[PDB]
Design a protein around this ligand. Structure first.
Ligand SMILES: Nc1ncnc2c1ncn2[C@@H]1O[C@H](COP(=O)(O)OP(=O)(O)O)[C@@H](O)[C@H]1O
Ligand SMILES: Nc1ncnc2c1ncn2[C@@H]1O[C@H](COP(=O)(O)OP(=O)(O)O)[C@@H](O)[C@H]1O
Ligand code: CLF
Ligand code: SF4
Ligand SMILES: [Ca+2]
Ligand SMILES: [Mg+2]
Ligand SMILES: [Mg+2]
Lengths: 476, 522, 271, 275
């Protein structure tokens, strides 16, 4: 109930000191589907209170980790000490096709590897030396990007000049990116720093080039990172509908695809938080319109295929119907097999920016009810989009602390919890089935119709796995 | 498309013809990919000697490092203590990364907190974050002790940890009495091992420095054991079991084994076990302090020898038959307790396994990498097994250590083709396996990729990866293994001989081709 | 529509003093102005404000501990004649970059909405001695379109003038940055004026106004007020109105031709 | 033991002229001395050198395009009294960090072997207007053990001196860097000596010397030579000998207790600078 959820929030906040307690209450809300504006309900995207175990990453993670790292052809240098590149290497599954270390470098870790001589003297000379070295060793790379770690902003290193001078010397595009960890308050400013970096150094190169032949059906998937091959499964559906996909941002992406993007007629934006900055820019500079779409679950996909097709002519609309007709028996078969298995099960989700709101349709397609949801680093426009999707009196949390999350889960008692790696081991211990939402628990793809079968099957094996019955010892 | 009866995951889903056609179209249509012949030409080039030279000529670019930063080392060590919460002063993205890197290797929850310093915190300093952070963390997680380490942003701006912590207590944010040991842990300097060493000397120093007069050496008749940075549970377990078996009293400082291994019984335990504060306080009263991994325990050796006046024995990490004999004999001399019949039986069994598996093991060539103590230990054991370690790489190693290992290699006729490389990454190693080919690679999960590259050149050129080391993320529960002692040696011996036998079977499995040698009894 | 100009010069030569006076003449004129000081000294906003010290964004934000946390009203306070005054502030000596403090302070104001407040003019009191990315930040992002450098008869003021002009030259293609004029502060030099204009001509910009040394200026400063404000009837007070009248009137922005050290040697030697 | 000294101050106050002249005197005495100017002007090595300009490590490193590729004999050239004169120089304005060029230069000088050359003294000319890490690097590394601040009767110099002392205090736990004294240059103010010593007392360090404003430095300077070298007999030549004598003789290095702007403001009026 609303009074009960409200009490639960108040009850939990009692443990915190006052500055932290006062600030946190602003981030916890009981959802009202009716409210138009998020700010009345919840406040978001504010610096985290120290010592509370927030799940948020840094700006480097948002820029190097999510937007930039997935491009296959380019080489990304983690500039600074050795750790950031190391923890983040091959951590995220933005799937790509290439010969690694030769023409594609995603899983590879490239670093300046700062030592104290570099921190005292500075790293510009080294970055230039590294750029030259990178060039002799890996001759087929199509670009270079420098992702700034925290010490770069602090020691006064100018990477723009080195990037500008070397780029000129190598007739190669080098993108300096200032995603220092201290900048921003979450993985979020990183996306913006990364988006802006893409726009200043890589978007306008084929500004005057008219050689590429373009059909009116050309479209670019924006903000789909191909985790587990999500983009590929999403891409095949658009192609079958008759649209041509010129570019993917940035999963399994290439710099050539990105430079050719402005040539496209429409931009489909899957992840609003990460790449909406680029989308708006493209609409202002090139006039290309952008529409947010959802491919999780058969209902969102059908609704999404339909909307995208309307923006196009009747042949496309007709083709859209054939495709929905084609995959309809496949998805319903999955529903028939797995809905009886997952029906009425309550779900709690914590993830960073796009997914808490987005996977709701898919869970509901399986008869599961999402009792509560939250975001690691989502803005309020993200929250505006969230409440319509969330049911009434459901719990909403922004930048939930670890302690808040455990207490909420103990009270609410959800059947299954979708969240990241740090949160997962605590919950299994508690005996609650956990599915990792970020990595799709090394499974996927969860996007599209093909993705949905994997998703229903995954929720079912974990939720109904025999191991949950076994936790209390028989001898009391 | 998906048959509901047998659903396909990414693999082999993308292997389907519609998807294959789609990817090709995407590759041909928008990727502007270099021709396959060119890609092939370039790939064969990296496998060559000429490329190794240019690759080994690098002075500024590091590709695929074998080392991680200091705070990782500091958080792991802080985890060793009872009801202790690791606390890292600096930016938060670092904490998320440490918890995830640890979570994946241990498949266990890792508790860590940050004071969350921002851009604004960069100009003013870390003082507010530290007071609020210390106050918020204590109220929220109820840790008995909070151990502070710092992120590079904090190290570069220069926040004073001692001043900050004292002012927090002085201003009243946290009690005066609440323990708050702190260690500066610059990521640019060293590695996670050094990070571990710093945190420990700091914790040891905070508890024992003010009171030394009351302490008298050998008064408590226990031997302090300092593990160092360790990611195998069996190691903590084995050291304790043998001392226990021998009857020797002991204190293991920084024991993270209960917490990293808590049971799923329906209740989540943030803190489990750990070294007690009293154990830390009463430590100088030990007869002696033994350091398990001496190469990264140098700062701690200085504090323990100088402040506690313990004469730390020079002993190598207890790996292999000789080193473990040396550690036991030494414990026997310090304890005054004899090595029991039970332990001598275990050594006998190790030798019996060595005599039993020697023909397959002999002459095998290995390329291996890791932290310096572990690599050093492994090198010593392989030579004891008569195997030939061709390429030895320690990224975070040094000149003295290299000198130490070369001496070890010189002592054995087996260490003839062996070469030690320090400051060289996995990219360098890739080149080494391609130019001079080892039978096997012993290392962490990062080597999965080197193996993939060798198989690409050819079946015959592939070097299978054998995983011993940290981090291991593609296999499950290996962190439950033991590398120390006779038990560790036995585990290591079984994995190497079986890795070798598993490979021979694969090579001889072809029907009417190579199956003549695909023997039932080996 | 809105022009933002930044005052640059060597320390101790009168930029805080010169800027405040020119702005009060402008305010007396009814023009709405905001003065943001990028100088670590933070005495930039002292005369209009009539306050001993103006708390910097950095001093206010440090106690609060976070930047968006801090209030605009507490940070930005209104001076005499309705002028807006704020101190960018900066870092502790030897920590981070002094110049970065200018940047967070300027972005906080943009986000907080100080600009697009229909402000007629914006002036940045800036430290002109060392050209650094952090110090030359207002030059890099187009924080300020027209830059006016305070210079005098000695070797240091002319050299710093040349250096700042060197800076405007490097960032010309990316920005709209131009050198607005050269304001000469009297060092009571024998041929100070001909020298600044001569140094100015070679440079490519006309010296906008010559400012004499007056004790009225010294006296107004002790009372913590501007000359225009303390004595409206004064010659020095009327002088400032000339520079302010000239600044509104001047329409010449030029990309500088930095001069060589030697020409500076021949030139100092010429007058 | 070879010695390292730094002159830090507000620009245009005579840091270079005073530093060069003191070293000429020590060169007169016979101590082997080396001067490195970390100020971007590089007119710092001009009086000793007898060169209109001195090509820097920064200028020399470029064109050459590699720092270690650059030769020492070309980079360091010996002056009057046999004192080595070298220039750190720096980047074209607005690009990178200026103090940074100072660091690469000392590193270059240390790596190429200038020190442990049994030079009795080493003098660093540094821009004292702003303190940030590139500038504060000599303070950060223990580049200069003893620091001397040139300052005058004007309020800007005292802000500069006060500002630099705050620098030393921050790097005090890490380093062996300590402020030596406050050198004083006369601008012909009413009570320059009394005012500087009061501030020195407030700062916690002694004002080392009072250097009179004289037209003789100018005559020697235009000739592009030092005062001690030009008129050994001159009165200004004896004063510079005294500073040289005072610096070698001085044994008081202290970590400064910085005064507030109010204390600085209050102390200027105490002598009547401001009513
Ligand atoms: N035109 C002037 N007439 C008289 N005194 C002046 C004049 N300009 C500046 N001053 C005095 O000289 C000093 C230096 O100028 P100031 O603006 O404070 O330095 P900065 O250029 O570093 O901001 C002040 O103490 C001020 O009273
Ligand atoms: N004692 C002195 N008496 C008179 N003039 C001096 C004296 N010391 C220096 N000067 C003059 O004053 C100026 C400042 O000295 P300089 O080293 O060039 O400045 P900075 O090192 O501050 O850039 C020079 O033009 C110099 O000739
Ligand atoms: S916020 Fe990297 S792990 Fe950290 S202490 Fe630095 S070296 Fe080590 Fe963000 S940019 Fe990166 S991820 Fe952190 S580290 Fe800073
Ligand atoms: S950029 Fe300039 S102000 Fe900043 S640290 Fe470097 S030299 Fe100092
Ligand atoms: Ca587990
Ligand atoms: Mg000022
Ligand atoms: Mg000088």
């Amino acid at each position: 109930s609303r009074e009960e959820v409200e009490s639960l929030i108040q009850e939990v906040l009692e443990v915190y000191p006052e500055k932290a307690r006062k600030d946190r209450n602003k981030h916890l809300a009981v959802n009202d589907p009716a409210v138009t504006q998020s700010k009345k309900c919840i406040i978001s995207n504010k610096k985290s209170q120290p010592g509370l175990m927030t799940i948020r990453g840094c700006a480097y993670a948002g820029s190097k980790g999510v937007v930039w790292g997935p491009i296959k052809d380019m080489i990304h240098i983690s500039h600074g000490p050795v750790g950031c590149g190391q923890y983040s290497r091959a951590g995220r599954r933005n799937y790509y096709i290439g010969t690694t270390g030769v023409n594609a470098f995603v899983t590879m870790n490239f670093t300046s590897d700062f030592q104290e001589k570099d921190i005292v003297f500075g790293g510009d000379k080294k970055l230039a030396k590294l750029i030259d070295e990178v060039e002799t060793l890996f001759p087929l790379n199509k670009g270079i990007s420098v992702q700034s770690e925290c010490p770069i902003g602090l020691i006064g290193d100018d990477i723009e000049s080195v990037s500008k001078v070397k780029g000129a010397e190598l007739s190669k595009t080098i993108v300096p990116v200032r995603c220092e960890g201290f900048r921003g308050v979450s993985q979020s400013l990183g996306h913006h720093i990364a988006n802006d970096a893409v726009r200043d150094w890589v978007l306008g190169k084929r500004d005057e080039d008219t050689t590429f032949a373009s059909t009116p059906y050309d479209v670019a998937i924006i903000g789909d990172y191909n985790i587990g091959g999500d983009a590929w499964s999403s891409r095949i559906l658009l192609e079958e509908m008759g649209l041509r996909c010129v570019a993917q941002w940035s999963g399994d992406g290439s710099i050539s695809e990105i430079e050719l993007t402005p040539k496209v007629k429409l931009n489909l934006v899957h992840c609003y938080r990460s790449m909406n900055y680029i989308s708006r820019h493209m609409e202002e500079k090139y006039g290309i319109p952008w529409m947010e779409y959802n491919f999780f679950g058969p209902t969102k996909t059908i609704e999404s295929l339909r909307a995208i097709a309307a923006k196009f002519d009747e042949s496309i609309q007709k083709k859209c119907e054939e495709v929905i007709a084609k995959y309809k028996p496949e998805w319903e078969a999955v529903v028939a097999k797995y809905r009886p298995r997952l029906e009425g099960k309550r779900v709690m989700l914590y993830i960073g920016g796009l997914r808490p709101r987005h996977v709701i349709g898919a869970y509901e397609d399986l008869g599961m009810e999402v009792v509560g949801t939250g975001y690691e680093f989502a803005h309020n426009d993200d929250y505006d989009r969230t409440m319509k999707e969330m049911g009434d009196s459901t719990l909403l949390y922004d930048d939930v602390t670890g302690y808040e999350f455990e207490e909420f889960v103990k009270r609410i008692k959800p059947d299954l919890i979708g969240s990241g790696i740090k949160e997962k081991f605590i919950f299994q211990k508690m005996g609650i089935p956990f599915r990792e939402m970020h990595s799709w628990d090394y499974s996927g793809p969860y996007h599209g119709f093909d993705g949905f079968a994997i998703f229903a099957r995954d929720m079912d094996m974990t939720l109904n796995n025999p191991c949950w019955k076994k936790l209390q010892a028989p001898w009391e | 498309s998906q048959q509901v009866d047998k659903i396909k995951a990414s693999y082999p889903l993308f292997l389907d013809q519609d998807y294959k056609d789609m990817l090709a179209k995407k590759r041909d249509g928008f990727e502007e990919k270099y021709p396959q012949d060119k890609i092939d030409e370039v790939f064969q080039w990296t496998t060559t000697k000429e490329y190794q030279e240019l690759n080994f000529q690098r002075e500024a670019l590091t590709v695929n490092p074998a080392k991680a930063c200091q705070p990782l080392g500091a958080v792991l060590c802080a985890l060793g203590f009872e009801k202790t919460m690791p606390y890292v002063h600096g930016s938060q993205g670092c904490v998320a990364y440490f918890r995830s890197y640890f979570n994946r290797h241990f498949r266990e929850p890792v508790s860590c907190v940050s004071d969350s310093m921002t851009e604004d915190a960069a100009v003013f300093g870390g003082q507010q974050n530290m007071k609020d952070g210390l106050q918020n963390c204590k109220a929220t997680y109820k840790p008995d002790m909070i151990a502070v380490s710092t992120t590079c942003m904090a190290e570069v701006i220069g926040d004073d940890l001692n001043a900050f912590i004292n002012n927090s207590k002085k201003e009243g944010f946290i009690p005066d009495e609440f323990p708050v040991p702190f260690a500066h842990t610059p990521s640019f300097v060293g590695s996670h091992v050094t990070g571990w060493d710093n945190m420990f000397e700091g914790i040891a120093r905070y508890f024992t420095l003010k009171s030394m007069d009351d302490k008298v050496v050998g008064s408590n008749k226990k031997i302090n054991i300092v593990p160092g940075f360790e990611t195998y549970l069996g190691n903590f377990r084995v050291i304790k079991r043998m001392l226990s078996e021998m009857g020797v009293g002991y204190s293991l400082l920084s024991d993270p084994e209960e917490v990293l291994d808590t049971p799923a019984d329906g209740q989540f335990r943030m803190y489990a076990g750990g070294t007690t504060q009293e154990e830390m306080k009463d430590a100088p009263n030990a007869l002696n302090t033994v350091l398990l991994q001496p190469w990264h325990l140098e700062k701690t050796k200085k504090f323990v020898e100088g402040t506690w006046k313990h004469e730390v024995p020079k002993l190598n990490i207890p790996m292999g038959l000789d080193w473990t004999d040396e550690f036991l004999m030494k414990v026997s001399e310090i304890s005054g307790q004899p090595i029991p019949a039970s332990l001598t039986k275990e050594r006998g069994r190790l030798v019996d396994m060595m005599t039993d598996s020697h023909t397959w093991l002999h002459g095998k060539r290995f390329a291996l990498w890791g932290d310096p103590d572990f690599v050093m230990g492994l090198v010593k054991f392989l030579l004891e097994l008569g195997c030939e370690p061709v390429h030895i790489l320690c990224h975070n190693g040094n000149k003295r250590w290299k000198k130490a290992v070369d001496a070890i290699l010189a002592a054995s006729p087996y260490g003839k083709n062996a070469t030690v490389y320090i400051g060289k990454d996995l990219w360098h190693l890739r080149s080494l396996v391609f130019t001079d080919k080892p039978d096997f690679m012993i290392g962490n999960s990062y080597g999965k990729f080197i193996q993939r590259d060798t198989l690409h050149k050819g079946k015959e050129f592939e070097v299978p990866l054998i995983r011993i080391g940290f981090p291991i993320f593609d296999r499950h529960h290996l962190h439950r293994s033991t590398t120390l002692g006779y038990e560790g040696a036995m585990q290591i011996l079984t994995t190497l001989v079986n890795s070798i036998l598993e490979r021979l079977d694969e090579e001889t499995r072809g029907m009417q081709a190579t199956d003549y040698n695909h023997d039932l009894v080996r | 529509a809105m022009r933002q100009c930044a005052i640059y010069g060597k320390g101790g030569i009168g930029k805080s003093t010169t800027t405040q006076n020119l702005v009060a003449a402008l305010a007396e004129m009814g023009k709405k102005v905001m003065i943001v000081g990028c100088d670590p000294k933070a005495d930039s906003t002292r005369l209009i404000l009539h306050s001993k010290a103006q708390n910097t964004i950095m001093e206010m934000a440090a106690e609060a501990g976070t930047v968006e946390d801090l209030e605009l009203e507490d940070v930005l306070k209104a001076g005499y004649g309705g002028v807006k005054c704020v101190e960018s502030g900066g870092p502790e000596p030897g920590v981070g970059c002094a110049g970065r403090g200018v940047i967070t302070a300027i972005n906080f104001l943009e986000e907080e909405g100080a600009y697009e407040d229909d402000l007629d003019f914006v002036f940045y009191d800036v430290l002109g001695d060392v050209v650094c990315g952090g110090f030359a930040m207002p030059i890099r992002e187009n924080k300020a379109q027209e830059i006016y450098i305070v210079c005098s008869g000695e070797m240091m003021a002319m050299y710093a003038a040349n250096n700042i002009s060197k800076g405007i030259v490097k960032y010309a293609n990316s920005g709209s940055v131009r050198l607005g004029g050269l304001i000469c502060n009297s060092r009571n030099t024998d041929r100070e004026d001909e020298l600044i204009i001569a140094l100015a001509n070679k440079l490519g910009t006309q010296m906008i106004h010559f400012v004499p040394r007056d004790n009225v200026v010294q006296r107004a400063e002790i009372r913590r007020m501007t000359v225009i404000e303390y004595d409206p009837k004064a010659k020095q007070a009327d002088e400032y109105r000339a520079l302010a009248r000239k600044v509104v009137d001047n329409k010449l922005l030029v990309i500088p031709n930095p001069i060589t050290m030697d020409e500076l040697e021949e030139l100092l030697m010429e007058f």
